Design a binder for this molecule. Structure first.
Ligand SMILES: Nc1ncnc2c1ncn2[C@@H]1O[C@H](COP(=O)(O)OP(=O)(O)OP(=O)(O)O)[C@@H](O)[C@H]1O
Ligand SMILES: Nc1ncnc2c1ncn2[C@@H]1O[C@H](COP(=O)(O)OP(=O)(O)OP(=O)(O)O)[C@@H](O)[C@H]1O
Ligand SMILES: N[C@@H](CCCCNC(=O)OCc1ccccc1Cl)C(=O)O
Ligand SMILES: N[C@@H](CCCCNC(=O)OCc1ccccc1Cl)C(=O)O
Ligand SMILES: [K+]
Ligand SMILES: [K+]
Ligand SMILES: [K+]
Ligand SMILES: [K+]
Ligand SMILES: [Mg+2]
Ligand SMILES: [Mg+2]
Ligand SMILES: [Mg+2]
Ligand SMILES: [Mg+2]
Ligand SMILES: [Mg+2]
Ligand SMILES: [Mg+2]
Lengths: 264, 264
């Protein structure tokens, strides 16, 4: 009844959180693999027959509706951005985590720079307060492990003008995570782009970093009003919602569809 | 009444297709600029007050519903892909249009490789026929002009197994563009990745290239069944729908929101 590392890895790929199957049950590999293969095929067949929606896409749509309905403008900004945005976010040569493209471009590691540009520009046209959000891919070179991806999906919402207080920021975070049914706490932390943050924690998992401005970086971006904002990783939200052991189950991938192995 | 090139460019930025304003009317720049600025601020204020949805995001959601409701599985696959996928799509060192990332990766220039992988894998689990689609960013270095972007958004749908005929492919294209209200014709063309294509044309604008397999490239991807597929550019669909002069009005950008200049 002794399984090799390769056999255990194959079974872990096929195991899903809802299964009440122990790989250490004492059953031989052939029977555990056959059982899990049958369950996962059934799971994919049910998805194909009924809903057909991708978890990341569906969560993006649900989040989009939530923020649009609360008065935030939906932004879709470039993923491929000037490398100069990095230096100007105060990221001195995190900078090592940047995927570079050609000589003067990079894949955005966060949504903040593009959203700062939109806050500044929209403040010339829209009534106070300015409320915007974006959901989309971001990129960082990571270690990684069970909680970091190199290609992940960020939500960042922000507001500039009136109402940009710690209590309003916390209230939006609370309403949002209550909508998703996710328990959390808020702890204070610091990072080097923004200074002090409010970190939104689910256990020992960071779901979001949030900031109450103004901060001295604002001048580099032409921001000259109070502001609040928060960034959330969608794959981390999915990891919590579906109780995935590893965040890769939630990622853009050819190896899992809605957390189900595609190697069947 | 003579406007400089810089003045005309500024007015063209602020002009929208619905305006019945001629820059050559004889009015001075100051009055044309003031009028257009007021119209565009009004337009953005109305968007902010009412719908708040981004054109690219909203079109993606509408397309997603169309294909999900017709039995296609929604895919979200990596944007950052192995450079090896390029060579294996038969793209010999289009290859010059690839944005390279590090030494062994690139930004995907098309959705086909990831979708071929999903067709192959899903054929081991799902009943015939296999029907899938993806919408998302793709990247090519272009010239460019009024119809090409370096960062654009592709829809690619495909089917493998039964029903993979020219007539079914045309029927899906027809139902899809009828749903969007876009007139078109089909013309034969060729490309070097897929061979003969059916090009979906709106006037002299190519909306899609479509392929009826099998093709000899299939073996490199483990595809061994009949298949059909088509790829559409969402920004080109928006250019037609909103009568934009230049495709940049439709792109991910900090310079236009739903075709309205953000420089106000
Ligand atoms: N590599 C990554 N993979 C997946 N999600 C991420 C990654 N980096 C950040 N996120 C998500 O984006 C949110 C805001 O990003 P932020 O810039 O605060 O990241 P972070 O503080 O470096 O995260 P961590 O401390 O876990 O590395 C995070 O709270 C997390 O949900
Ligand atoms: N650079 C681009 N910018 C915007 N849309 C594009 C671009 N390249 C391709 N598309 C869209 O993707 C669809 C399928 O792409 P395909 O690989 O057939 O491109 P293509 O034939 O090179 O386009 P074109 O002939 O106009 O350069 C095209 O019909 C078009 O709608
Ligand atoms: N993941 C991010 C943390 C996200 C916190 C929210 N940030 C935001 O809403 O930015 C908009 C903004 C507005 C005004 C001035 C400047 C700026 Cl950036 C990080 O890397 O710390
Ligand atoms: N824009 C693209 C044209 C898109 C046409 C549709 N292609 C497709 O559905 O691929 C799936 C697929 C299935 C099976 C075997 C191989 C493959 Cl690729 C280009 O660059 O010509
Ligand atoms: K389990
Ligand atoms: K990924
Ligand atoms: K016009
Ligand atoms: K773009
Ligand atoms: Mg980090
Ligand atoms: Mg952190
Ligand atoms: Mg953080
Ligand atoms: Mg081309
Ligand atoms: Mg062409
Ligand atoms: Mg083509």
């Amino acid at each position: 009844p002794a399984l090799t590392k390769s056999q255990t890895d194959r079974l872990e790929v096929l195991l899903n959180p809802k299964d009440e199957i122990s790989l250490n049950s004492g059953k031989p590999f052939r029977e555990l693999e056959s059982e899990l293969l049958s369950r996962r095929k059934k799971d994919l067949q049910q998805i194909y027959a009924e809903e057909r929606e991708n978890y990341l896409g569906k969560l993006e749509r649900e989040i989009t509706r939530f923020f649009v309905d609360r008065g935030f403008l939906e932004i879709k900004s470039p993923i491929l951005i000037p490398l100069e945005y990095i230096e100007r976010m105060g990221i001195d040569n995190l900078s090592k985590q940047i995927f570079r493209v050609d000589k003067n471009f990079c894949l955005r590691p966060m949504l903040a720079p593009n959203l700062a540009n939109y806050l500044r520009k929209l403040d010339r046209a829209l009534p106070d307060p300015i409320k915007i959000f974006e959901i989309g891919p971001c990129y960082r070179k990571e270690s990684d492990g069970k909680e970091h991806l190199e290609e992940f999906t960020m939500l960042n919402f922000c507001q500039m003008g009136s109402g940009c207080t710690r209590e309003n920021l916390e209230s939006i975070i609370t309403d949002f995570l209550n909508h998703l049914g996710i328990d959390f706490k808020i702890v204070g932390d610091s990072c080097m782009v923004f200074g002090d943050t409010l970190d939104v924690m689910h256990g020992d998992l960071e779901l979001s970093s949030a900031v109450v401005g103004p901060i001295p970086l604002d001048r580099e971006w032409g921001i000259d009003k109070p502001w609040i904002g928060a960034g959330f990783g969608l794959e981390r939200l999915l990891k919590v919602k579906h109780d995935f052991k590893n965040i890769k189950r939630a990622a853009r991938s050819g190896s899992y569809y809605n957390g189900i192995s595609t190697n069947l």
